[PDB]
């Protein structure tokens, strides 16, 4: 649950942590693990291309099955697990044929529950179906964008997508952003919301907590010299400029989407 720490030190005074007793306390499932070393925000040229990234705790990648294409073989949830690579919990499920897979844990999924993917699966949380077989008004997550490609929408903790209409070969979704989008009716979705909905109530409490997650400090543009930022310079605290990015593009309200390729699928922007 959500527990406040006690102020035995200034760095603990404001910490709020989210603790789940249900999470498996042992090592993860070794066959489904890979190495993933860190980048530091650097690309193959060796240059910082995304700022504010570096350090943090070592992590191993858990191969999560986002496709859910083992059709017609029921599986049972073995345990819930902590995944360092995302904000949601991953459930280790076991198929009747002896195969084990990691899936995103929906809300309410406890150990021992039965899940199944396919066109004929029951309408219950954790089951993956094509959205033409999912009834309208249903709440889904791990939504696909192209058939067979893998779920891509509503994968963070507590997120979900609502199927608001079905007209022909396309279903209309309401994304978490508030955007109304069309996607093909043959894409798959998993019923129910993503678990760990209390993830947003946590409070890191101190700077070290953010440094543990690989996040490096942010230097304000207005604290720099003019050679460094458009906001730099001044005698005392001076701004007198329209706010911009470090590369001179206006940064409060100016839209940046430009994709006429996918413009056709957007029923209504998020506003």
Partner RNA sequence: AGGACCGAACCGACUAAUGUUGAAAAAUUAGCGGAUGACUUGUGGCUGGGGGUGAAAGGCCAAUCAAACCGGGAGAUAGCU
Partner RNA sequence: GCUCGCCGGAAGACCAAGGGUUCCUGUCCAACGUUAAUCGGGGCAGGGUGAGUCGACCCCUAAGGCGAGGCCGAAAGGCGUAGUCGAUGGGAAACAGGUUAAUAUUCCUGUACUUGGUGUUACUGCGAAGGGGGGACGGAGAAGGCUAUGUUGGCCGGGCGACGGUUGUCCCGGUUUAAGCGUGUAGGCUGGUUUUCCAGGCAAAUCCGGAAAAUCAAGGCUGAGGCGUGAUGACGAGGCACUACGGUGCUGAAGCAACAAAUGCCCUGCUUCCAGGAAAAGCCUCUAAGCAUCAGGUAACAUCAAAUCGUACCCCAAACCGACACAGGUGGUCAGGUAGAGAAUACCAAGGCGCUUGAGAGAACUCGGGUGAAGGAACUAGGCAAAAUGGUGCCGUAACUUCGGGAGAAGGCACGCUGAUAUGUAGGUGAGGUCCCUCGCGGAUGGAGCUGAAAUCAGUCGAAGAUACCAGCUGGCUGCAACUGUUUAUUAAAAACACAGCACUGUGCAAACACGAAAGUGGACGUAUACGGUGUGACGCCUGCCCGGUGCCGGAAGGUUAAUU
Q: Which of 119, 122, 123, 223 binds RNA (CB under 7 A)?
A: 223
Site for RNA in 125-144 (CB under 7 A): none
Rounded CA separation 213/52 (Å): 11
Which among RNA, Mg ion, none contacts residue 135 (Cβ within 5 to 8 A by kind)?
Answer: none
Rounded CA separation 214/88 (Å): 18
Pick 25 or 168: Cβ nearer Mg ion: 25
Contact 60, 34 (CB under 8 A): yes
Which among RNA, Mg ion, none contacts residue 138 (Cβ within 5 to 8 A by kind)?
Answer: none
Site for RNA in 160-219 (CB under 7 A): 175-177, 179, 181, 196-200, 202-213, 215-219
Minimum separation from the CB atom of position 236 to RNA (A): 10
Pick 210 or 267: Cβ nearer Mg ion: 210
Under DSSP, the state recorded for 260 is T
Site for RNA in 236-255 (CB under 7 A): 237, 239, 242-247, 249-255
What's the length of the chain? 271
Minimum separation from the CB atom of position 37 to Mg ion (A): 12
Give the strands of the sheet with 128-130, arranged side by side.
128-130, 188-191, 139-141, 161-167, 170-174, 180-184, 266-268
Minimum separation from the CB atom of position 116 to RNA (A): 9
From the number of C-beta atoms within 10 Å of its C-beta (0-12, 13-18, 19+), residue 140 rates as buried
Pick 132 or 211: Cβ nearer Mg ion: 211
């Amino acid at each position: 649950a959500v527990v406040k720490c006690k102020p035995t030190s200034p760095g603990r005074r404001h910490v709020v942590k989210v603790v789940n007793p249900e999470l498996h306390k042992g090592k993860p499932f070794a066959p489904l693990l890979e190495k993933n070393s860190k980048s530091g925000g650097r690309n193959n040229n060796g240059r910082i291309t995304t700022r504010h990234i570096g350090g943090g705790h070592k992590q191993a990648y858990r191969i999560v099955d986002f496709k859910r294409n083992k059709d017609g073989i029921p599986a049972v949830v073995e345990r819930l697990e902590y995944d360092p690579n995302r904000s949601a919990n991953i459930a280790l499920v076991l198929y009747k044929d002896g195969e084990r897979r990691y899936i995103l844990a929906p809300k309410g999924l406890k150990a021992g529950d039965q899940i199944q993917s396919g066109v004929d699966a029951a309408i219950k949380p954790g089951n993956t179906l094509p959205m033409r077989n999912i009834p309208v008004g249903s709440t889904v997550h791990n939504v696909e964008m192209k058939p067979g490609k893998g779920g891509q929408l509503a994968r963070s903790a507590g997120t979900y997508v609502q199927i608001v209409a079905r007209d022909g070969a396309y279903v209309t979704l309401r994304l978490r952003s508030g955007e109304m989008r069309k996607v093909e009716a043959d894409c798959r979705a998993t019923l129910g919301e993503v678990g760990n909905a209390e993830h947003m109530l946590r409070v890191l409490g101190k700077a070290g907590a953010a440094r543990w997650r690989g996040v490096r400090p942010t230097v304000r543009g207005t604290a720099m010299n003019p050679v460094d930022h458009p906001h730099g310079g001044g005698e005392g605290r001076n701004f007198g400029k329209h706010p911009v990015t470090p590369w001179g593009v206006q940064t409060k309200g100016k839209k940046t989407r430009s994709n006429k390729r996918t413009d056709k699928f957007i029923v209504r922007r998020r506003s």
